[PDB]
Curated annotation (Swiss-Prot), chains A, B:
Subunit annotation: Homomultimer. Interacts with envelope E protein in the budding compartment of the host cell, which is located between endoplasmic reticulum and the Golgi complex. Forms a complex with S proteins. Interacts with nucleocapsid N protein. This interaction probably participates in RNA packaging into the virus. Interacts with the accessory proteins 3a and 7a.
GO biological process: symbiont-mediated suppression of host cytoplasmic pattern recognition receptor signaling pathway via inhibition of MAVS activity
A single MF term (Gene Ontology): protein sequestering activity
Whole-protein coverage range: 17 to 204 of 222
Source taxon at top rank: Viruses
Protein name: Membrane protein
Intravirion side: 21-28, 90-188
UniProt organism field: Severe acute respiratory syndrome coronavirus 2 (2019-nCoV)
Length: 188, 188
């Protein structure tokens, strides 16, 4: 049974190792690895509760573990049905993340890049670092001040909020810094 | 031995429960709870490796677990000595966090609020949401457009970077949005 303990040790060790390089340098491969890695936390939690409930000798702790496993499974299925409700409308793979059900669509370089967004703030920042665009902690790619998006969107079940570009601030040679004020909330 | 399994189940359940309320509404109490909660991940990882190594029957897996426990302990002590090197200069409690060793000092309402900062970007955003100031995901407090800081600092072992306020953008009634361009890097 120590194999599962060594597996959780490997998981914890690599997750700790994730907190020295990937937190600063944001790569799409590393981000999606971290995302699917957080998505697998729910089944391993359920597995821990299951292996706690299999060896039931007394009924108090076993009943507590069974009730909590039922609750966490119910809320996991609630999250699954929420992600299904989102994906039935926005039709985006990033709607199946365990982080949030709030989507950010940015039309950069023609392709619509979709990223998870924390809370859909009324004003959304856009920061240019050495010609690289980042919005809400997501490095969308290499976009200098000339090709900045004009209008982006925030997608949600029965909600689409349009965000219009504000003023652009050219400073420190090539770095730029701009705001997205909320325009309107619709569902056509 | 199932008590430790139920403890890790409680930890995972409450950490999953943390991903529905505290991620959107940022409270200082909830943030510091999450911070000390991430700080206790290192000893529980070491404990998992220790309980994997105590029941050594074969030598291959036991040796692998012992070597990995030694490596994770060595890097944990490296992190401890890094935090000590930081705290010997900046003298701030927030230097003892497992997230980052990059400090952000903001002079808001007279008191110098210090927060962890991800990577010390050359341009730092400041967003006003309903009269509340947030910088790099940290809700520093209630600060409208009038009392915005003039100059903030980023603290680091043998580094202090001064950040000067840029242009201020008043939009949507009371919301504001401003930039901190890097001024100079010193250590006096």
């Amino acid at each position: 049974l120590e194999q599962w303990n060594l597996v959780i040790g490997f998981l914890f060790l690599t997750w700790i190792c994730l907190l020295q390089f990937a937190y600063a340098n944001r790569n799409r491969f590393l981000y999606i690895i971290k995302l699917i890695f957080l998505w697998l936390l729910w089944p391993v939690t359920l597995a821990c509760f299951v292996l706690a409930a299999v060896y039931r000798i007394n009924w108090i702790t076993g009943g507590i573990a069974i009730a909590m496993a039922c609750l966490v499974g119910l809320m996991w299925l609630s999250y699954f049905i929420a992600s299904f409700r989102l994906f039935a409308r926005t039709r985006s793979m990033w709607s199946f993340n365990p982080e949030t059900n709030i989507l950010l669509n940015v039309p950069l370089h023609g392709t619509i890049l979709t990223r998870p967004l924390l809370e859909s703030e009324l004003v959304i920042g856009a920061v240019i670092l050495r010609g690289h665009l980042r919005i809400a902690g997501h490095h969308l790619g290499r976009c200098d001040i000339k090709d900045l998006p004009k209008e982006i969107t925030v997608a949600t079940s029965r909600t689409l909020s349009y965000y219009k570009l504000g003023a652009s601030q050219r400073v420190a040679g090539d770095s730029g810094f701009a705001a997205y004020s909320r325009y309107r909330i619709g569902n056509y």
